[PDB]
Design an enzyme around this catalytic site. Sequence first.
Site, mmCIF file in Angstrom:
data_model
loop_
_atom_site.group_PDB
_atom_site.id
_atom_site.type_symbol
_atom_site.label_atom_id
_atom_site.label_comp_id
_atom_site.label_asym_id
_atom_site.label_seq_id
_atom_site.Cartn_x
_atom_site.Cartn_y
_atom_site.Cartn_z
ATOM 1 N N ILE A 1 -23.086 3.622 -2.289
ATOM 2 C CA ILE A 1 -23.517 4.887 -2.909
ATOM 3 C C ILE A 1 -22.524 6.038 -2.717
ATOM 4 O O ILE A 1 -21.689 5.992 -1.814
ATOM 5 C CB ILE A 1 -24.939 5.326 -2.432
ATOM 6 C CG1 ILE A 1 -24.914 5.858 -0.990
ATOM 7 C CG2 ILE A 1 -25.914 4.154 -2.610
ATOM 8 C CD1 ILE A 1 -24.760 4.801 0.071
ATOM 9 N N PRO A 2 -22.609 7.088 -3.564
ATOM 10 C CA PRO A 2 -21.749 8.278 -3.566
ATOM 11 C C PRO A 2 -22.080 9.422 -2.596
ATOM 12 O O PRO A 2 -22.976 9.322 -1.767
ATOM 13 C CB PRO A 2 -21.844 8.728 -5.011
ATOM 14 C CG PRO A 2 -23.291 8.569 -5.257
ATOM 15 C CD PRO A 2 -23.608 7.203 -4.642
ATOM 16 N N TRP A 3 -21.353 10.522 -2.735
ATOM 17 C CA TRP A 3 -21.523 11.691 -1.870
ATOM 18 C C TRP A 3 -22.509 12.753 -2.326
ATOM 19 O O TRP A 3 -22.770 13.689 -1.580
ATOM 20 C CB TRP A 3 -20.175 12.389 -1.655
ATOM 21 C CG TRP A 3 -19.422 12.634 -2.928
ATOM 22 C CD1 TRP A 3 -18.376 11.909 -3.387
ATOM 23 C CD2 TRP A 3 -19.687 13.638 -3.923
ATOM 24 N NE1 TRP A 3 -17.966 12.387 -4.606
ATOM 25 C CE2 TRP A 3 -18.752 13.448 -4.961
ATOM 26 C CE3 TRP A 3 -20.622 14.678 -4.041
ATOM 27 C CZ2 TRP A 3 -18.718 14.264 -6.115
ATOM 28 C CZ3 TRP A 3 -20.593 15.494 -5.191
ATOM 29 C CH2 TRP A 3 -19.647 15.277 -6.207
ATOM 30 N N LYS B 1 -22.818 0.433 2.242
ATOM 31 C CA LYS B 1 -21.581 1.180 2.454
ATOM 32 C C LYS B 1 -21.683 2.617 1.949
ATOM 33 O O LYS B 1 -21.612 2.874 0.740
ATOM 34 C CB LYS B 1 -20.445 0.451 1.719
ATOM 35 C CG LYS B 1 -19.055 0.540 2.330
ATOM 36 C CD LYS B 1 -18.418 1.891 2.105
ATOM 37 C CE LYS B 1 -18.037 2.117 0.665
ATOM 38 N NZ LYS B 1 -17.625 3.530 0.518
ATOM 39 N N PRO B 2 -21.875 3.580 2.861
ATOM 40 C CA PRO B 2 -21.968 4.966 2.389
ATOM 41 C C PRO B 2 -20.611 5.433 1.878
ATOM 42 O O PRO B 2 -19.616 4.723 2.003
ATOM 43 C CB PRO B 2 -22.429 5.734 3.634
ATOM 44 C CG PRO B 2 -21.904 4.902 4.764
ATOM 45 C CD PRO B 2 -22.182 3.488 4.298
ATOM 46 N N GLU C 1 -25.680 2.147 -11.406
ATOM 47 C CA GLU C 1 -26.280 3.451 -11.666
ATOM 48 C C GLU C 1 -25.119 4.414 -11.947
ATOM 49 O O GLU C 1 -24.524 4.970 -11.029
ATOM 50 C CB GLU C 1 -27.086 3.901 -10.449
ATOM 51 C CG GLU C 1 -28.243 4.812 -10.784
ATOM 52 C CD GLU C 1 -29.038 5.238 -9.560
ATOM 53 O OE1 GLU C 1 -29.392 4.356 -8.744
ATOM 54 O OE2 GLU C 1 -29.316 6.452 -9.423
ATOM 55 N N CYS D 1 -24.858 14.130 -10.704
ATOM 56 C CA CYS D 1 -25.119 13.437 -11.958
ATOM 57 C C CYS D 1 -26.394 13.915 -12.674
ATOM 58 O O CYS D 1 -26.471 13.877 -13.906
ATOM 59 C CB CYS D 1 -25.178 11.921 -11.701
ATOM 60 S SG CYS D 1 -25.879 11.417 -10.086
ATOM 61 N N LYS E 1 -10.161 17.756 -4.112
ATOM 62 C CA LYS E 1 -9.971 16.990 -5.342
ATOM 63 C C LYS E 1 -11.008 17.448 -6.376
ATOM 64 O O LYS E 1 -10.680 17.752 -7.527
ATOM 65 C CB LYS E 1 -10.151 15.494 -5.036
ATOM 66 C CG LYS E 1 -9.753 14.530 -6.154
ATOM 67 C CD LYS E 1 -10.047 13.074 -5.747
ATOM 68 C CE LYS E 1 -9.426 12.041 -6.700
ATOM 69 N NZ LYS E 1 -9.851 12.191 -8.114
ATOM 70 N N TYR F 1 -12.812 20.176 -6.192
ATOM 71 C CA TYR F 1 -12.519 21.596 -6.350
ATOM 72 C C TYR F 1 -11.519 21.811 -7.483
ATOM 73 O O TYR F 1 -11.834 22.449 -8.494
ATOM 74 C CB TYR F 1 -11.941 22.130 -5.041
ATOM 75 C CG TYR F 1 -11.503 23.586 -5.047
ATOM 76 C CD1 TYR F 1 -12.440 24.629 -5.055
ATOM 77 C CD2 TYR F 1 -10.147 23.920 -4.987
ATOM 78 C CE1 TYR F 1 -12.031 25.960 -4.996
ATOM 79 C CE2 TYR F 1 -9.731 25.241 -4.928
ATOM 80 C CZ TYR F 1 -10.670 26.255 -4.931
ATOM 81 O OH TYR F 1 -10.238 27.562 -4.864
ATOM 82 N N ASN F 2 -10.315 21.270 -7.298
ATOM 83 C CA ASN F 2 -9.246 21.379 -8.285
ATOM 84 C C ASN F 2 -9.682 20.926 -9.668
ATOM 85 O O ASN F 2 -9.436 21.616 -10.659
ATOM 86 C CB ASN F 2 -8.032 20.558 -7.846
ATOM 87 C CG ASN F 2 -7.227 21.244 -6.762
ATOM 88 O OD1 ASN F 2 -6.823 22.392 -6.919
ATOM 89 N ND2 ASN F 2 -6.982 20.545 -5.660
ATOM 90 N N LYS F 3 -10.333 19.769 -9.736
ATOM 91 C CA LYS F 3 -10.790 19.229 -11.009
ATOM 92 C C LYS F 3 -11.665 20.232 -11.778
ATOM 93 O O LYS F 3 -11.546 20.354 -13.000
ATOM 94 C CB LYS F 3 -11.540 17.916 -10.774
ATOM 95 C CG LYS F 3 -11.540 16.970 -11.968
ATOM 96 C CD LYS F 3 -12.021 15.572 -11.561
ATOM 97 C CE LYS F 3 -11.892 14.553 -12.701
ATOM 98 N NZ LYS F 3 -12.296 13.169 -12.289
ATOM 99 N N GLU G 1 -17.847 16.292 -18.724
ATOM 100 C CA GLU G 1 -18.939 16.875 -17.948
ATOM 101 C C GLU G 1 -18.356 17.837 -16.913
ATOM 102 O O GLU G 1 -17.212 17.666 -16.479
ATOM 103 C CB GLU G 1 -19.723 15.776 -17.227
ATOM 104 C CG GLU G 1 -20.687 16.298 -16.162
ATOM 105 C CD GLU G 1 -20.907 15.307 -15.020
ATOM 106 O OE1 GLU G 1 -19.902 14.825 -14.451
ATOM 107 O OE2 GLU G 1 -22.080 15.018 -14.683
#
Lengths: 478, 482, 480, 477
Positions: free
Chosen positions: B165-167, B191-192, B267, B301, B347, B349-351, B398
């Site tokens: 899964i993501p952050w 796996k976090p 997902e 998301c 990363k 942030y910049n994006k 997005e």
Amino acid sequence: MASLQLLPSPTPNLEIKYTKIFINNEWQNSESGRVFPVCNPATGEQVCEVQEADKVDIDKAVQAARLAFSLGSVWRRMDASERGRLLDKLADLVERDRATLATMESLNGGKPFLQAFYIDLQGVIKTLRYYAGWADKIHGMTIPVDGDYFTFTRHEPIGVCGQIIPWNFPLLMFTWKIAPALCCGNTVVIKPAEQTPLSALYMGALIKEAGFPPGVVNILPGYGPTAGAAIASHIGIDKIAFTGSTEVGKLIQEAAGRSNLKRVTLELGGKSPNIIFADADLDYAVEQAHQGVFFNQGQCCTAGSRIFVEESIYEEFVKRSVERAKRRIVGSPFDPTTEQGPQIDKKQYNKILELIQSGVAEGAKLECGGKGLGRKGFFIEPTVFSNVTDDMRIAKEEIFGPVQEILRFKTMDEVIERANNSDFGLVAAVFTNDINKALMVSSAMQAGTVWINCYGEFGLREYSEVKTVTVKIPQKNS
Amino acid sequence: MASLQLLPSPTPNLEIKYTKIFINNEWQNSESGRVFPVCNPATGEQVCEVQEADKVDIDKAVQAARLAFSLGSVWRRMDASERGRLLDKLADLVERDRATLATMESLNGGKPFLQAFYIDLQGVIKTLRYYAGWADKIHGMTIPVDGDYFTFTRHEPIGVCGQIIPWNFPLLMFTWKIAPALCCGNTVVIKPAEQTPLSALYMGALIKEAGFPPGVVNILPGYGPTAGAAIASHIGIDKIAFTGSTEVGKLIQEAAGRSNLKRVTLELGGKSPNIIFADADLDYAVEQAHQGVFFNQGQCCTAGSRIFVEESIYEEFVKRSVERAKRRIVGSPFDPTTEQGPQIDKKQYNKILELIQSGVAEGAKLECGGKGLGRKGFFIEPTVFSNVTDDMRIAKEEIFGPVQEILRFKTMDEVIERANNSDFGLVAAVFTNDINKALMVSSAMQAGTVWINCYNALNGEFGLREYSEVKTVTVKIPQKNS
Amino acid sequence: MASLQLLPSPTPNLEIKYTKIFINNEWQNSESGRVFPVCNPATGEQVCEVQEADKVDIDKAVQAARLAFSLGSVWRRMDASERGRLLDKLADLVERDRATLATMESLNGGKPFLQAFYIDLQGVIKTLRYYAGWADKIHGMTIPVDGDYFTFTRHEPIGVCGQIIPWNFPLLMFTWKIAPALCCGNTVVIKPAEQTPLSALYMGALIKEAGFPPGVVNILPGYGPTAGAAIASHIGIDKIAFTGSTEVGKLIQEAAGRSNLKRVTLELGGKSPNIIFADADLDYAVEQAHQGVFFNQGQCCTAGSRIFVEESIYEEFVKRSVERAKRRIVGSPFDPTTEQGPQIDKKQYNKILELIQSGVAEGAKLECGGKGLGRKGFFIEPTVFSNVTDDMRIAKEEIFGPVQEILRFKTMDEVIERANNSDFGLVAAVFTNDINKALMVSSAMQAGTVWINCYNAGEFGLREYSEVKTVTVKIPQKNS
Amino acid sequence: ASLQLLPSPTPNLEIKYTKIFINNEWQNSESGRVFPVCNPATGEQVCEVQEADKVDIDKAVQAARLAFSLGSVWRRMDASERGRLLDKLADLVERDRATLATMESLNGGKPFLQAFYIDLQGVIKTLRYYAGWADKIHGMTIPVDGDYFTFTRHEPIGVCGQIIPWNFPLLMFTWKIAPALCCGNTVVIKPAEQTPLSALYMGALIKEAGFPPGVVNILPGYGPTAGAAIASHIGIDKIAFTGSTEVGKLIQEAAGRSNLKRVTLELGGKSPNIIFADADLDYAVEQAHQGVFFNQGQCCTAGSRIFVEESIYEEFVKRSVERAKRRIVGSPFDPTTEQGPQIDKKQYNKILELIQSGVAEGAKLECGGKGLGRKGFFIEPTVFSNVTDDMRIAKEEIFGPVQEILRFKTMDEVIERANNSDFGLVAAVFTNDINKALMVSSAMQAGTVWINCYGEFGLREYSEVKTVTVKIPQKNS
Ligand SMILES: [Cl-]
Ligand SMILES: [Cl-]
């Protein structure tokens, strides 16, 4: 000319071929020998005579029903998918004789042919097809239980089922009860209303033709206090399905416990409020509430006289509401232009007028109509009342005929409270464009079914019983 | 005047007690001894170091899950109702240490503490409790089959399930994957994300405490190309559940097909368009639309930056929405008044910035904000774009940050056709008092979920279907009767 | 009294009327003009030529299906109950032309006509009717949720569905995929096996005749590496249903993941071991264990060739089995006395013989048969094997042909462990009168399905063909 | 060897709760009348309890009604909250498990260790189970012809009236309170007159747990008064009854003559046991034994009749008599007793006169036959042999420590015999033959069939469906 005249057309040369008792796929004469008349509610005329069944006939019917349901039985070993095929074959035969059947419903019950052909019979066929598709999809379950066990259930047919229906939708009612019950594997002993056993008897013919094993469906025409009571009390009948008047249901539930405590189901009356809000487009509101209150000669339990309208529009609605009733074509059911047929009985005929009088002599402003139409038949003119209040008798008692009361309300909380005042039984038909008002009302409405801007699985649950089995297993593993 | 701070308080400078791999209810060091830092996105300062898992560690984890799932196993013989009792016991502990878990949540993901406390952790507890009640209520069926037969079906666990899964919602994500899977009787190797492994590791502690048999849940902090990749390609894992970027979603399914044809669930993100009709209370629409776009720092998301507003009210809406942004409190996640914390990375942030620059340098009218805040942390000011068009990049890409685009539409079909334009994936919020519009729009929306007059943190009975397989048995019987 | 009242037969040299690609209810010719031959597995002779589809052809079919699924669409606004009648009408048409359909099934795949008629088409008709019933009974739900809300769910169709199936049961396979999908409102782009597409195309004809909107069903005959691969990689197909080898299955999921992440379903092979305990009626057991190993020429994934017998009855069983094979009638599938037809390919044929030999040159005791029959066709004689052990190639590899291997065993914990050992995929059949053994085994067998005292491989099937859409509305004040 | 003890009764249990429970308030009977409660082991009076009648049943219903009215806290409460309450109730029951099992063992004379390890286990378990159902009761979205959208909601009926027996006081109360509360209903439950203690106690827990006032009302008293007052109340929506068929007939009749409320009836029924020669004689004898003597035989889920296959009819009766011969009958609070007293003197006599009956009709009284001593309603383990279908003890049900042992030969025989029952049937079969197990289990007209031993459908009678269909501009799949 280019007149597409060719359309569904009844049949005046409709001679009633089936007028005897249907037991074990055979046409019998009443044990007693008695016979009862069947009348045409549009001319007062006598259509024919039907064998009057009684206690004794009910016994034979039940005997064939139990035999047809025994362990050897072809109806008991038959794959479920086949029961479906048979319900489906029956639906095909109903389509083939759709006209002669729709004709009896018109001829025998006084319902405008085009409506009997396009609405009622559509449903008959629709429900037969639908339930035919349920027969082999009735599922039981395996349950995870504590311990080294494995339990699971099987839904099985109750057994012999007694059915008793009214005259509102003779064929429809007969189907709505026959399909679910057969769908589940039961055998039937059905008693149609005494003033409408024809289409019911005709279905008996189609049933035998479709291939149903003898004994599965038994149709016994006759009187309520006689045959209907012999059923509701019969000792070898496992269940009973009733639908009609509340006062008669009580006699049913009581005769149920008295006898053998057989399972019991009662489909009783109930008031049918309608709540039109100012935000609803008046036009559509009028027609619908007008068709919802006058459909099937207004004498259908699924209809609702009382019509709560918002003040901001109480004016126009009342006016538009009476214009329609004025132009409503009331005539002979065989006439493709008639919208309103005759009432079913003289007894019924009077109870309506007698209640129309109550209103007038109590404050109700008669906006149009008010009395019967002519000689013979049992027609009554489209009656519309204005300035009605909750304490009147026409508002308290339900009007089972071409009569619509127009009430007025201001606040929402109001109608919700006023329309919810019903001692068991209730159906609502809200009309709005406001999600909120619609949501709130449909929720606050203590009604069994709510319609918003218009006027299944839970069906075959009372026609089957659960049989759980649990087995001890060496060692359990998820 | 008697205003006291009864309010929950983020434990002062928490001590991260758990930073190692969790296998067989035992805390191990990395096989390689490697280690990686975890950072505070609010200050840009390090919080601690965590062991780094790799191929070899995933391998020991799978061996553990395997053994914990074998035929004799305590976890395999356990009554379903007991698994439920365990999920509930775990819910109790989460409630007990609710303050420090929301502290790590806020401390590691930079999310407003009060939000991590009243929203995120409420959900963690809620879903745990919810699935607990499901454990002994998963049924199979008995089917009426033609012939003298009797067939029935049992719903059994799949076996070892890999989870990645993501952050975005570290603890929520961990919980959403755990509860359903344990509920069904599986074993887990989860796996976090590399940026947010803490809250998860702490759950490993409560799991051992709660009573879960060793090997039932194995937590391995580490990287995607290594740890995650080893999970996806692992020959001994029966099922894998992934949520994250669609770009990585493709590598997961490919690894799956290339290795052992393990079951795969993905997902993936997607766009979350918003539709505001002039017949909706303009006031409430600005708050909700604002809350659904800037919530959880806009980087989630479940948040939809684009907002289609009806012309009749475009004017007003643009004005009301800018005020909301200007008054938007952006500060330290521990200040009970902060409504927006920092973005997760530099990363990320910049994006967002470079993407914001695009809009400005392409036509969009920059109503306010557009650059970061101070030094330290990754805070970006509430940006609001106007006169935005579909062709624009901000419209097509997005905006996973505190950025909202306001577009204007006239007809209904328009909004619908326009909003519907997407590629595999879509959530949508609609605001109206018109039942018809709500219905037309709700059905015509090619989305997996539609909200009417509300946003809410997005993503029951359909959940535990992916964590169990069907087994059917048909027995020949002497004679079949009804 | 000598009642020569017979009446079930094929059709004299059937003329294959449908041999072109079927798109938008229209018969096209391959964009390229290419064509591939279809051959009679019994004679080796050619039956006809079929248009060969490829990338380009797949695109149009996908386009037509796409259009057929768009909003206003006729197939999208249709009542669910109407989708059901259409499947029932298709069932009727299949009934009318049952003779010609079973002829192709026999003529193309080489399965005894009578079996194709009473079994395969019973299944086709049964499944079609069955799903025709599910059409208006797919319910979503209302969920009691926290807060002043109201959430409900709707089960909608996924969209464009690609489908790829084998030669084992051409028509059955085709039906099993079409029905569930159409029943749910999806649109299909289906690719039958290259060696058996005739029955498939004919169904296209019936589909149009039944009333199905153009584009709902698209049928494309062609090869795996080309047509099948373009479906799996197509950027506009929302989901693919594959059934065939695990090797190709692997490629499908990869292509899936490397293209548009479409949903993927794989119906792979697997071992189908049977277990026979002394307590079972040796007679019955031999008859069931036999058909289930020689049925559909043994080349039916839904039936394995391995049979574990208990030491006590191994003796009699081996003899009972050999006598059965010895009396098996192999011959022209159009002759009603024939039980076994020819194998499907020269390729499948050799693979069976090479494998039989292997067993011989490795210790297995060849009790009977072991080689092909005559010239013309791909027949192989009923081949039984005795004294077989796991380590033997024949035991490890599946024998997709008329070959049964009989293995001996003693303890339960034994067979249970041997039967299980398998890499993804298992189906088992157990014969016993002991509730206990039957139970322990059926719950121990890591199989997706298990048969007790029988052998011949619903609601969960129409789940892969629909997705969930949950809607939730905010409301003033919530009450239960 | 030195041993230790841990599971023990609450010493010299005092009854703190003896009043009527209405609106989470302990009231006194309006009439002021009061009735006694007795210990079936000694025969002495345990305490007195307020007696409810028509007027009391009336306040309760008012309470329940208001507690179910729209605006209400209980009606607005998230469904997941109703479950937490149930769960907290399960916790509170675990905390006081010992004293609850004490009352159950002191009021109904059931051996404490069974009332602790069995009865109470089920109370907690079923409470936890339904806790988990509260937010998982779904309605559905139905695809309808035409431009419409129809959905259903499973809503709570409203005011439910409950009446249970004395066989398993707490369990019964729990089994009926859980499903109903789980579904959102309000209750008016009436425990048996001879066993109200454990019920009244739960009243305190329900209040402690946080259930809003009026959701549950426990009105102890007599049936012809309180029980009937419920059955006929015009403001009770549904009624749940479990007990004797003779009273059930009155129940349904009453509910029909009143307001046509929903009626459910958990009635008696025989519990035949079929044993084949192929089953393991040992397991079979001990299982059939525990199954006929559990709860002192006085429990509907116990079947006296025990059909044994000729081939092994010999040994089975012997092994059985030995069992009965060694069954320890004693005080409910003594950890070595396996059989307490019978609930009543009335029930006591019945059991005996029925025992004499068998002896006086051909039965071969293998052992036991009479009561025990003074004080208490104990009855030594009885066991008949060579019993035939015609004998009264076989036709009528023996609700006490009495087991018959009929003999048989063909399967078709037992299936026909054991099947002969006028509504109501449960059965246990012992075999190692799948076929017999199948032929039999499906040929038995029983609601349940146990094989080698002896949910979702439960929360259905406590809710009704409310279907809603909306008109929409245009429908798309
Ligand atoms: Cl590779
Ligand atoms: Cl690539």
